[PDB]
Design a protein around this ligand. Structure first.
Ligand code: MG
Ligand code: MG
Ligand code: MG
Ligand code: MG
Ligand code: MG
Ligand code: MG
Ligand code: MG
Ligand code: MG
Ligand code: MG
Ligand code: MG
Ligand code: MG
Ligand code: MG
Ligand code: MG
Ligand code: MG
Ligand code: MG
Ligand code: MG
Ligand code: MG
Ligand code: MG
Ligand code: MG
Ligand code: MG
Ligand code: MG
Ligand code: MG
Ligand code: MG
Ligand code: MG
Lengths: 61, 156, 127, 197, 106, 175
RNA sequence: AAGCAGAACUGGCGAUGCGGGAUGAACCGAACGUAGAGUUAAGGUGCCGGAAUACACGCUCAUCAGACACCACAAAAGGUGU
RNA sequence: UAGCCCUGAAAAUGGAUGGCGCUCAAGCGUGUUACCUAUACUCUACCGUCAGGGUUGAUAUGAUGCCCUGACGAGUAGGCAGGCGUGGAGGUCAGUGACGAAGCCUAGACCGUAAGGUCGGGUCGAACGGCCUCUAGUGCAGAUCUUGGUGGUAGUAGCAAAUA
RNA sequence: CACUUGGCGGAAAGGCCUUGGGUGCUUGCUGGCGAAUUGCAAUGUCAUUUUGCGUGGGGAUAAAUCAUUUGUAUACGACUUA
C-alpha cells in the first residue's frame, strides 16, 4: 500500500513519434533521432521535437 | 501458406556461459567424524549397522568397513549425512587405507581382489577390537529405535 | 532436440471457464468477463473462480514454446516446409488439417530429409 | 504411544476431559472412556440439574422426534460434550468419532486392561478445594437414566474380582522384589548401578 | 532384535491455516516425544516419509511413498512445519508419518 | 439396420424392429426393461403370466403415483403394473426375432434377450377442449422398439537397481 | 425519542476485494498483477481452530454468574455475601 | 466510600458469550513473555504499464528492432488504447481439397492472461483458408424478447349429469 | 508352538489362570564358519481386512413369495387365516 501523490502510470503527454505514416518523414525522424542522441547540440533536439508536431502546431512560415 | 511466416527468425547460435565464480573447496566434516569412530548407518541395505570409519575419500564420502568378519559389511563408501557418529573409537594406525580411493569403487560375482583387501583391512581392525570388551558383540548387533527413545535427548 | 530453454512455467494451467457455464447449457465456456453490478466473480469474493489478468502472462523467454521446446509453424506443402530449413532448432512443422494423405507422405519425407520436426506425423496415416 | 488409551472417567471434569479426548481423536488416537457415571461437573448439583432442564425444554415445536435429542446416560452426556468440540458434520470429524467409546462402568474387555487418567482434567487437581461439584451418575438418574442400580451392582462384582487379582499380583510382586533384592549387591548389580540401572 | 525402526513416529495433524483459510503447501507434524520448539530444532531439516498402500502394483510394489522435509518449528509445543514434494492428501489428518534421522548432525 | 449400442456376435445374434408403434413409450420401456437379459423362453412365459395377471411388470422409472401391488415383491419393488398393450407389442417382436433366429439356424434353447431398446417415436397430435374456450394438446407417445437375441456362449515389469538386488539377495538367501 | 428529519469538518461505503468483529456495505487492520520465502497488523492461542489447559498478583460462587469497542440493553434504590 | 456478586429483573415456536463447555477459569482488573496468521511490510523471480536512457562509418543487415535502469499495478458509471472473432470486397500465397472442402461430434493433444487459434480420431460429400488492406445488416443469457422445438409436472389430474 | 488337565469369567462373558508331556529356540558363558556388487539414499515391500477360484477332510438335507383362500384387517400395499 502506497498513498500516491501523483497519478500512477501517467503518460508523458508529448509526442515521441509523428502520427503520420509518411515514410520519408519517418526517416527524417530517425536521422534526427541519431543526431539528437549522438550530438550535444540543442538544435538537433529542437528539430526532432518539431518533426513530431501536428499540422496546426506547425503553421506555415 | 497455412501460416504466413515469422517476420524475422531467432538466432540459433547458442550463447556461451558466463565465467562462474564458484571454486570447489574441501569439505569440513563434523567434529565427531574422525577415523576409527564407530558409525551407525541410517540408510541403505545396511540400515542400522554399526561400522568403523576408516578414511575420508575425495568425493566427500566416508570409507567404512564394519568388519566383514563381525557384521558382514564390506569396504564401501557412505555419505556423511546418512551416518550417526558415536563416541566409541578404535585406533586406526594399523590399517593401510591409502590403497582405497574414488576409482577403487568404480563400476564399469564378487571381485577376487576385494576379498583379500577386506581380509587385510579387518585383520588389524579385529585385532584392535578384541582389546576392549563387548565391542565385537556391539558391532555385531544392529542398532534400532525402541519405545521411549528420543534421539534429540539421546546421545550417541 | 531444440535449443536449450529455461524450465517452462505456465503460472496457470487450468482453463479460464465462464462463470455459470457449468450451471446453464446456453452459457458457453468461452471466457466472458462478469459485468453485473452484484457479481461475486467480478467483485473477487473468496471461494470464487479466478479471472484472466496480465499477471498470468508467460515468460517471454519461453512463450509460444511447445514442451518439445520448439515453436509451432503450420505448413501446408513442401514449400512452406522449406522455410524452416535453417531453423530446425527453433521451429517444428505441423501439417495442416486439410492436407490429403498422399500430400502428407511427401511432407513427412521432405521433413525427414531436411531435419524438420513434425508434431503430427501420424495424421491421415494408413496403417 | 499405545494403540488404545483407556481413560477412567472417575474424578474428571466433564468439559476438560472432553476437550483433551476430542483433541486426541482428531489427532488419530483411539480412546475408550470407562466409568462415565463417575464424571464430575463443577458447580452445585441443583445448578447443573437446572441447566439440564433448560436443555430438556429445547425441542423442535412441530415435531419433537426431530428435535434436539436429550440423552440421559452419563456416557451420552459426555458424548454430547465431545460433540461441539469436534466438527462432527464432516467426514474427518465423523471418522474421529469412531475412535471413541464411552461406557458406564468398566465392561469387558476393558476390565482386564490398564486405565489411565488425564491430570489436566482431574477434579482434585483442577478444582479449588471447598468448591462444590456434581457427579454425572447422580445428575443422569435425576433426569431419567434408568441404570444406576445395575451399573453399581456390576461394578461391585468387578471390584471384588479385581481386588482378589490385586492381592495375587501384590504377592507375586513381593516375591519378585525379594528375588531382585537377593540378586542385587552382586557383581552384575554393581555394574548395572554404575551404568545408572 | 524385535524392532527395526530407524525413524521417529509422527502424526500429520493439519495444514497451515488461519481460522477460515488453509494452506495445503505446508503441513503440521507432531513428532512424538517432542514438547518444545527447542526440542523440535533437532528434527529441523530431517526427511519425512508418508508411507501408504495401494491395491495396484505400479513398479514392483504395492506400497507408495510421499517424501517431505521438516522446514521450521510451529507454536510452543514442539509441532513443526513440513513441506512435501506433493502435498499430503488431507485424508491423512491423523495418519502416522516417519521422521528419519538423516540428514544427520548429531 | 443401425441398432443401438450392442456388444454381441452378429453371427450368433438375431434381431427384430418395430417403429412408430402406437403404444405408450413409458409403459413399453418398463416392459422391455423387465425382460432384458432373460432367456427367450423364460421371458415369453413371463409375458403370458403378465397378461394373465399372475406376474407383473415392475415400474422403476415412470412410476409416480402408481398403485402398489404384492406382485412387485418378486422384483423387490412396490409399484408394478400389467401393461397388456406393451406386452403384446413386445412379445410380437420376441416371436419375430425368434423366427429370424430359426431362419439363421441359431439354437433356440441357448437364446437370450441380449439387447432391447425402447425409444420415443414422433408424437401424434390430437386436440382436447378445456374450460373457458381453451384448447390443449392430446398426444400419443409412440415407441420405436428394437431387440436382439443371441446364443449364450461360454505386463513388462520395471525394477530399480535396489529392487533387482533385493530379489537376487532373497533368492540367494532362501533355499 | 428513533435503524427519525436537517446542517459543519474529515474519513469511509457507494465504486472494494482481503485478515479480524460467529454472522453484517460503512467498525478495526490493511486496500488487491502472478508466485515463493520471511515478518507482522487488527484479532487471538481449552476443543471446534492455526497458536501457552503460559507465567504472576488479586477479586467473584450467581436455585436468571460472567465472558457485549461499534453491538445488538438495563436504572433509581438497597444486601453483617465478600 | 467503592470492587465483584445478589435483589430490583415480566412475553409470547425451542436456542444461543458463535457452539461445546468453563469455577485458585477456559470469568473479571492488571502485568510480562512466547506463539498463530492478511491479497499488508521486506527480499527475489515472472507479466504488464509508465518513465529515464543505450544502440549505425556492418547498429555483425529487422531502429514501430534489440537492450539497460527505476518505479508502479484496487475499481462501478465512464474515457482511451492494443487485440480476438463473423458475412462480404481488392491484392497475394501459381494456398487447401473427391487420395475428401465446409459443417458437426470427440472428460484426446498443443499454443495464447484472454477473446480465441491449431492438431489427431469419427461422420460427411464440394467447396474453403493464411497474410496485407477495404466494408458492415459483425459477436447475446436475460428484454413477462420473436419464431420453432423440447422438458419436469406425469402415465399424473382426469375420461363420474341424461335409471341399464 | 500345537497337544492336553482343571477351574473361573454373561455387562458387550469369546478372555484369564492352571496341570503334564512333547517339539524347537535360547544372547546366561565360550568358540568356528557366512554376509559384499541393493554398487554413497530411495517404505525398499515382512502388517491386516474382505471376496473369489482350486484342492482335500468333516457336517446338514429348508423355506419364503406370488397365485387361491379368511375377514378379527384393509384406499392400494400391508395384516390376520386356511
Ligand atoms: Mg492454458
Ligand atoms: Mg482459458
Ligand atoms: Mg461464453
Ligand atoms: Mg453494489
Ligand atoms: Mg498454521
Ligand atoms: Mg391420485
Ligand atoms: Mg374438456
Ligand atoms: Mg449507483
Ligand atoms: Mg471475514
Ligand atoms: Mg458479534
Ligand atoms: Mg490448536
Ligand atoms: Mg486476566
Ligand atoms: Mg486496474
Ligand atoms: Mg475477411
Ligand atoms: Mg491443389
Ligand atoms: Mg472433412
Ligand atoms: Mg461434450
Ligand atoms: Mg453433392
Ligand atoms: Mg444486428
Ligand atoms: Mg439465447
Ligand atoms: Mg446481458
Ligand atoms: Mg421467455
Ligand atoms: Mg387416475
Ligand atoms: Mg348415466
Amino acid at each position: 500500500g502506497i498513498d500516491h501523490t501523483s497519478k500512477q502510470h501517467k503518460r508523458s503527454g508529448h509526442r515521441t513519434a509523428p502520427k503520420s505514416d509518411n515514410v520519408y518523414l519517418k526517416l527524417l525522424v530517425k536521422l534526427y533521432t541519431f543526431l539528437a542522441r549522438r550530438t550535444d547540440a540543442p538544435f538537433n533536439k529542437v528539430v526532432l521535437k518539431a518533426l513530431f508536431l501536428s499540422k496546426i502546431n506547425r503553421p506555415p512560415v | 501458406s497455412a501460416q504466413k511466416a515469422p517476420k524475422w527468425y531467432p538466432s540459433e547460435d547458442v550463447a556461451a556461459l558466463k565465467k562462474t565464480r564458484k571454486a570447489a573447496r574441501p569439505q569440513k566434516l563434523r567434529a565427531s567424524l574422525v577415523p576409527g569412530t564407530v558409525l551407525i548407518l541410517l540408510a541403505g541395505r545396511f540400515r542400522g549397522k554399526r561400522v568403523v570409519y576408516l578414511k575420508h575419500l575425495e568425493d566427500n564420502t566416508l570409507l567404512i568397513s564394519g568388519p566383514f568378519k563381525v557384521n558382514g559389511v564390506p569396504l564401501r563408501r557412505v555419505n556423511a549425512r546418512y551416518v550417526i557418529a558415536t563416541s566409541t573409537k578404535v585406533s586406526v594406525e594399523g590399517v593401510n587405507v591409502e590403497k582405497f580411493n574414488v576409482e577403487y569403487f568404480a563400476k564399469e560375482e564378487i571381485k577376487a581382489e576385494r576379498v583379500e583387501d577386506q581380509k587385510v583391512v579387518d585383520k588389524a581392525l579385529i585385532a584392535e577390537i578384541k582389546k576392549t570388551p563387548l565391542l565385537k558383540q556391539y558391532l555385531s548387533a544392529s542398532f534400532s529405535l525402541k519405545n521411549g527413545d528420543k534421539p534429540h535427548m539421546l546421545k550417541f | 532436440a531444440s535449443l536449450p530453454h529455461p524450465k517452462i512455467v505456465k503460472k496457470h494451467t487450468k482453463k479460464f471457464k465462464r462463470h455459470h457455464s457449468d450451471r446453464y447449457h446456453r452459457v458457453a465456456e468461452n471466457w466472458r468477463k462478469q459485468k453485473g453490478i452484484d457479481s461475486v466473480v467480478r467483485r473477487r469474493f473468496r471461494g470464487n473462480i479466478s479471472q484472466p489478468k496480465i499477471g498470468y502472462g508467460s515468460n517471454k523467454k519461453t512463450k509460444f514454446l511447445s514442451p518439445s521446446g520448439h515453436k509451432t509453424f503450420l505448413v501446408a506443402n513442401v514449400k512452406d516446409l522449406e522455410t524452416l530449413t535453417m531453423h530446425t532448432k527453433t521451429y517444428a512443422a505441423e501439417i495442416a488439417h486439410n492436407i490429403s494423405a498422399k500430400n502428407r507422405v511427401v511432407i513427412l519425407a521432405r521433413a525427414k530429409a531436411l531435419g524438420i520436426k513434425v508434431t503430427n506425423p501420424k495424421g491421415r496415416l494408413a496403417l | 504411544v499405545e494403540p488404545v488409551v483407556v481413560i477412567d472417567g472417575k474424578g474428571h471434569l466433564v468439559g476438560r476431559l472432553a476437550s483433551v479426548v476430542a483433541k486426541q481423536l482428531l489427532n488419530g488416537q483411539k480412546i475408550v472412556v470407562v466409568r462415565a457415571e463417575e464424571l464430575n461437573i463443577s458447580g452445585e448439583f441443583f445448578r447443573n440439574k437446572l441447566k439440564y432442564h433448560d436443555f430438556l425444554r429445547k425441542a423442535t415445536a412441530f415435531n419433537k422426534t426431530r428435535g434436539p435429542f436429550h440423552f440421559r446416560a452419563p456416557s451420552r452426556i459426555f458424548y454430547k460434550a465431545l460433540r461441539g468440540m469436534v466438527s462432527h458434520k464432516t467426514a474427518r470429524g465423523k471418522a474421529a468419532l469412531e475412535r471413541l467409546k464411552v461406557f458406564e462402568g468398566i465392561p469387558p474387555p476393558y476390565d482386564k486392561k490398564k486405565r489411565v487418567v488425564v491430570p489436566q482434567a482431574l477434579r482434585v487437581l483442577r478444582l479449588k478445594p471447598g468448591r462444590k461439584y456434581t457427579t454425572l451418575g447422580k445428575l443422569s438418574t435425576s433426569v431419567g437414566w434408568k441404570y444406576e442400580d445395575v451399573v453399581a451392582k456390576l461394578e461391585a462384582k468387578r471390584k471384588v474380582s479385581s481386588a482378589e487379582y490385586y492381592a495375587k499380583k501384590r504377592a507375586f510382586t513381593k516375591k519378585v522384589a525379594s528375588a531382585n533384592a537377593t540378586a542385587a549387591e552382586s557383581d552384575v548389580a554393581k555394574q548395572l548401578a554404575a551404568l545408572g540401572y | 532384535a524385535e524392532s527395526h525402526r530407524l525413524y521417529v513416529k509422527g502424526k500429520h495433524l493439519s495444514y497451515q491455516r488461519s481460522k477460515r483459510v488453509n494452506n495445503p503447501n505446508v503441513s503440521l507434524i507432531k513428532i512424538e516425544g517432542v514438547a518444545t520448539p527447542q526440542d523440535a530444532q533437532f528434527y529441523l531439516g530431517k526427511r519425512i516419509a508418508y508411507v501408504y498402500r495401494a491395491s495396484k502394483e505400479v513398479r514392483g510394489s504395492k506400497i507408495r511413498v510421499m517424501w517431505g522435509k521438516v522446514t521450521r518449528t510451529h507454536g510452543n509445543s514442539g509441532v513443526v512445519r513440513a513441506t512435501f514434494r506433493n502435498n499430503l492428501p488431507a485424508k491423512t489428518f491423523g495418519a502416522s508419518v516417519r521422521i528419519f534421522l538423516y540428514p544427520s548432525n548429531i | 439396420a443401425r441398432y443401438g449400442a450392442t456388444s454381441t456376435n452378429p453371427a450368433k445374434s438375431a434381431s427384430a424392429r418395430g417403429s412408430y408403434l402406437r403404444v405408450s413409450f413409458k409403459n413399453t420401456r418398463e416392459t422391455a426393461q423387465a425382460i432384458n437379459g432373460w432367456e427367450l423362453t423364460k421371458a415369453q412365459k413371463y409375458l403370458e403370466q403378465v397378461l394373465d395377471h399372475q406376474r407383473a411388470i415392475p415400474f422403476r422409472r415412470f412410476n409416480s403415483s402408481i398403485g402398489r401391488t404384492a406382485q412387485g415383491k418378486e422384483f423387490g419393488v412396490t409399484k408394478a403394473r400389467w401393461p397388456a398393450k406393451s406386452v403384446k407389442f413386445v412379445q410380437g417382436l420376441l416371436q419375430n426375432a425368434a423366427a429370424n433366429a430359426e431362419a439363421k439356424g441359431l439354437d433356440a434353447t441357448k437364446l437370450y434377450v441380449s439387447h432391447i431398446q425402447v425409444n420415443q417415436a414422433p408424437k401424434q397430435r390430437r386436440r382436447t377442449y378445456r374450460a373457458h374456450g381453451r384448447i390443449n394438446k392430446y398426444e400419443s407417445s409412440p415407441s420405436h422398439i428394437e431387440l436382439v437375441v443371441t446364443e449364450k456362449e461360454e505386463k513388462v515389469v520395471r525394477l530399480t537397481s535396489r529392487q533387482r538386488g533385493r530379489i537376487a539377495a532373497q533368492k540367494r538367501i532362501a533355499a
